[PDB]
Amino acid sequence: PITGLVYDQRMMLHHNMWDSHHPELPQRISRIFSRHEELRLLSRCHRIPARLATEEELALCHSSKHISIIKSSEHMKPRDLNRLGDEYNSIFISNESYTCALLAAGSCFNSAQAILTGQVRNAVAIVRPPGHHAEKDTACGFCFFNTAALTARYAQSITRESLRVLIVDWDVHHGNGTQHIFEEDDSVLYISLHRYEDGAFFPNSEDANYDKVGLGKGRGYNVNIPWNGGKMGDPEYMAAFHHLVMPIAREFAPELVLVSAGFDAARGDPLGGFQVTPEGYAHLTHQLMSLAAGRVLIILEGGYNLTSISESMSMCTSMLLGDSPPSLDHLTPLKTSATVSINNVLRAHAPFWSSLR
Template identity: 25%
Template sequence: MDAFYADHFVLPLPEGHRFPISKYRLLRDGVAGAPGLNLLEAPAATDTQLLLAHDPVYVQKVITGTLEPKEQREIGFPWTPGMVERSRRSVGATIAACQSAVRDGIAVNLAGGTHHAYRDKGSGFCVFNDAAVAARVMQRQSAHGFNVAIIDLDVHQGNGTAAIFKNDASVFTLSLHGDKNFPFRKEPSDLDVPLADGVSDEAYLEALDAALEQLNKVFTPDLLIYLAGADPHEGDRLGRLKLTHAGMLKRDQRVFEYSRALSVPLAISMAGGYGHDIETTVAVHRQTVLEALSFSQSLTFI
């Protein structure tokens, strides 16, 4: 199974910044050497690819460092050339994971999940929307109609993704998220499942099962993009849900088995994770990657 990384393209952050940038290097270190896992450097998304999902004026502002101070504050990162390169690589990793998944059945971006980025602005530590760009790239490369389902299980609603694909019948957006959590102004996904604070394993998995059943009734995907956020975990300082480590594993397994049942390739990105202890976040992400690797070794349909 291919796994794409970009943690060596440094996103320079000031001392004490609350974004857990070190988790990506720790995750790569934590899965390196797993038998059957191919760690590959993420390619950089091109301007042409970014423009499939983003406004040209916005892309140009990001590249040239001419965002307004308010726009930069909404992203949450200071502008640097490194920010631009890292953002390109994060998108490129999801594109590459989608391409690899179509060939091999499943693949992983060890970062990504930047679902708060809109067509014309960034937000919430998201500069470019990797799932949206990747979906458009895969559709452009297909010789026939190509449907993509984005299964967003980050604890925060995928507002940017929902807005980009509003009224687009070729992409289905599904989001399970904390109802009272960021973003406080939600955008309507094709299927939103808002969850109360404190939801634990059983209720979460019941909600996920129902959502996947509903998705199966109304949409036939050619590709699944799964945002496997670590932030529903009980150890997350921003998540406000109470999933255990075992519950997070069952969550991942539900999505993997859904892709198997449909014989549809699956690309995974890590999305959010803000544990009180960064090692807890890394452990959740590592569990997702290693379970995906185990799943890849049982695939026969691709």
């Protein structure tokens, strides 16, 4: 059983030229990659080459008008990069941004193909800029193109259109772009856990609440798990996986699992304010590996504490390689509010998932 790994230093080139310390830092992926080297995990993995995604592949999810405006930033003067970025919600653009976003997407494509043709069982994608806030027609929250949403359609395009793909989004933020792209779609199951605070948390939309369950044929195939009033940690994430994520996923029987793996719910992240530990991420990964004959691709999204994301993603890779899941804790009743969120999700999805309890 082989674990794949994709990483390309050129993705570092994307940067914020008006705040060189912006938390979506080039060094996020180099610090994660370096930690993989030091922990002797990188040598255990099959190295998958990065590549540029093509514009045709971007068209699997994005409008040609959005593609063309982002492609055009590669030749913009600083003044126009600044105006263009300011047209979006929380976006900065450099001249290298388009190429880096193409590389993060093509990297994940090659990983998905490696998994789907049998070259590897599972894989990990150390990529940037992130993807999950990007919409069909717009960029948002440090994301230009929806890497995870593209990878699901890419996977379908190289197999069959109805390939069952589960996307688990454990980034602390709701993946509004991923929800919206597949909202009518019953071939892609989207499950997001996210800090919500009654809609007061980025992306600041009631679209992230538990009562958005999908539209049309897609009703039931959009599972939002919103967290309210509480510094959620391992016990809460493990409880959501037990009562919602794994039961629903198993009933869906995916053939591929994409993890939109933001690490901004990690202990130490100032944007997230949550406290999931590395061993917590390790346990979530291990539960996901019981699906889809192990076809699990972990994709870096958010995560802004360099040490935290490097330890946490390393933990996930260690699990993919087959290392034993590490010990966590005992008892530790959930935070009150987390039982409330979980129960609310259970009720809204009972009509769609008959194995829910």
